[PDB]
From a paper:
[name] (DHFR) is a key and essential enzyme in the folate pathway that converts dihydrofolate (DHF) to tetrahydrofolate (THF). This coenzyme is required for a variety of cellular processes, including the synthesis of purine involved in nucleic acid and amino-acid biosynthesis. The active site is located in a cleft formed by α-helix 1, α-helix 2, α-helix 4 and β-sheet 1, similar to CglDHFR and CalDHFR. As classified in E. coli DHFR, CauDHFR could also be designated to have two subdomains: the nucleotide subdomain, in which the NADPH sits, and the substrate-binding subdomain, which is predominantly formed by α-helix 1, α-helix 2 and β-sheet 1.
In order to reveal the binding modes of PYR and CYG, we obtained the ternary complexes CauDHFR–NADPH–PYR and CauDHDFR–NADPH–CYG. Interestingly, two CYG molecules are clearly observed as electron density in the DHF binding site of CauDHFR (named CYG1 and CYG2 here). CYG1 binds in an almost identical manner to PYR, but a secondary CYG2 also binds within the active site. For CYG2, the pyrimidine region interacts with the positively charged lip region, which is classically occupied by glutamate moieties, and the phenyl group occupies the apolar region that is classically occupied by the PABA moiety, stacked above the first CYG compound. The ternary complex with CYG only has slight conformational differences compared with the ternary complex with PYR, except for Phe65, which moves by 2.6 Å. This is most likely to be due to the steric clash that would arise in the ternary complex with CYG if it was in the same position as in the ternary complex with PYR. The Leu60 residue is shifted towards the NADPH molecule in both ternary complexes, being shifted 1.4 and 2.1 Å from the apoenzyme and holo­enzyme, respectively, with respect to CauDHFR–NADPH–PYR and 1.1 and 1.6 Å, respectively, with respect to CauDHFR–NADPH–CYG. The exception to this trend was CYG, with a significantly lower IC50 than would be expected from the thermal shift at 401 µM. This is a surprising result due to its largely similar crystal structure when compared with the CauDHFR–NADPH–PYR complex.
Numbering used by the authors:
A (entry chain A): -4 to 203
B (entry chain B): 3 to 203
Amino acid sequence: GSHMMSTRPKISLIVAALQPSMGIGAKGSLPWRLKNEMKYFKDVTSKAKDGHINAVVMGRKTWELIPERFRPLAGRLNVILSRKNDDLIDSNGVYHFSSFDSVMKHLEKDSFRFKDMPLDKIFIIGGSQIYNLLILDSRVDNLLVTQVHFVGEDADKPQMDTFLDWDLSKWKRLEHDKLEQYVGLDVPRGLNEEGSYNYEYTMWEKAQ
Amino acid sequence: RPKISLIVAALQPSMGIGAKGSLPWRLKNEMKYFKDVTSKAKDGHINAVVMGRKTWELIPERFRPLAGRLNVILSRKNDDLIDSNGVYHFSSFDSVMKHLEKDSFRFKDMPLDKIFIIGGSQIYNLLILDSRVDNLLVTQVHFVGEDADKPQMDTFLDWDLSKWKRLEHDKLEQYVGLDVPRGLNEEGSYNYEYTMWEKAQ
Ligand SMILES: NC(=O)C1=CN([C@@H]2O[C@H](COP(=O)(O)OP(=O)(O)OC[C@H]3O[C@@H](n4cnc5c(N)ncnc54)[C@H](OP(=O)(O)O)[C@@H]3O)[C@@H](O)[C@H]2O)C=CC1
Ligand SMILES: NC(=O)C1=CN([C@@H]2O[C@H](COP(=O)(O)OP(=O)(O)OC[C@H]3O[C@@H](n4cnc5c(N)ncnc54)[C@H](OP(=O)(O)O)[C@@H]3O)[C@@H](O)[C@H]2O)C=CC1
Ligand SMILES: CC1(C)NC(N)=NC(N)N1c1ccc(Cl)cc1
Ligand SMILES: CC1(C)NC(N)=NC(N)N1c1ccc(Cl)cc1
Ligand SMILES: CC1(C)NC(N)=NC(N)N1c1ccc(Cl)cc1
Ligand SMILES: CC1(C)NC(N)=NC(N)N1c1ccc(Cl)cc1
């Protein structure tokens, strides 16, 4: 049909955000190490329909936070955004593009395929500048937000300096079963506990 | 330099903007859009609002200056001074732009993000010919009541829109920095739509 079509991959913003501030960063890096949350990130961004592959799209600084031994993130099309990029694909298969608009156009011309595999989902994986722009892009279909809560001792609280500029009243939180349907995986329900943190996996779609 | 916008709400197709020193309609959500847009700035930045002397006088004194924004008022009779509240009383757009630039486009150590020209008709009709204006933010207002109740207006834009081109909605949102309703909004006997325009070239 013409409503909620399938002519391009769905686009998700996926982030882990500290409540209530939507804090995401401290001194240029991630303020917590949540082992199972990072497993969820890998599992979700890698899970694709048979014979498909997903993309991960990120700002240049977030790319630079990934240890070199991890690059490019395995099993996914990696796209890096930098204003001076030349919209080229390098010898490692990494896409270096100058805007989200430019990479979306290039993928469409290639039939949303990457090395003879169709794309399933496109995930925007950070960082702050990219999230603050793309929350306004009408093409974004949903948010995958891990809501992170610090429950430890006051001395151990994370010292945050970077926050999402997102208006969640423009979005609506979905039922857990809808999250599972979208990501293609069984997902823990409710609060998960690790160390000094609790966290919950959530999915949001546009309001109204 | 900061980008410069003319921001206006105008009745279609006459481009009427006022009647007897007030707006011809009472649209609470449209006024909130104006407030949200003109106040939305990058962290540590501030926006300016530039207006003619007569529109300044229409703001109730208790609400002057418009909070959270650098207020500039144009009157041929101003001495180019900054008052105790930080209000810029300037004699021309020229003079205030040259002063802001000599200050590195900063106000109290905050860089200017955007400069908004907020009316009224005399300022709009002059400044739409100023090469420094980058875009128009036009709320297109439509009267949708009965013919017997159609509004009277006394003040109008004189704009040649053939010199401008309307942008897609996502470009409006990116510029103003906010998620903005698309298409026609309804309040009472009026519908209205938020639009953005750049120079046609
Ligand atoms: N889930 C979480 O909690 C996450 C948190 N983060 C946090 O985010 C922070 C880093 O965010 P940030 O510093 O904003 O860096 P980003 O990862 O957003 O990369 C910023 C760079 O992206 C490029 N860029 C920005 N806007 C555009 C554009 N419109 N078009 C093209 N390229 C663009 C520029 O690269 P150039 O300068 O080369 O032009 C800019 O310097 C860190 O604290 C990190 O920990 C990161 C990911 C997820
Ligand atoms: N719908 C909308 O979006 C808006 C509607 N309005 C409506 O517009 C009407 C008011 O508009 P208008 O009557 O045109 O008044 P303006 O707000 O344009 O103020 C006109 C005054 O601006 C000063 N001025 C004009 N040209 C110059 C210049 N070249 N250099 C310096 N100063 C200058 C003069 O002040 P002096 O005489 O002191 O020199 C002049 O009297 C009202 O009905 C109001 O409600 C107002 C704003 C927006
Ligand atoms: C925080 C984490 C691990 N979890 C999550 N839910 N969303 C995102 N984007 N995440 C992330 C992924 C890759 C990079 Cl390089 C930086 C941060
Ligand atoms: C690659 C990812 C998500 N997966 C993993 N297993 N370990 C780490 N450190 N990871 C990471 C996390 C945050 C940032 Cl900012 C950059 C890379
Ligand atoms: C009409 C309104 C509220 N909405 C809009 N879109 N543009 C402008 N300039 N507006 C306005 C703002 C302040 C003043 Cl004092 C007079 C009119
Ligand atoms: C600027 C604004 C919205 N803010 C406020 N607090 N009160 C009033 N009257 N305002 C107003 C509305 C229309 C016109 Cl023509 C002039 C000023």
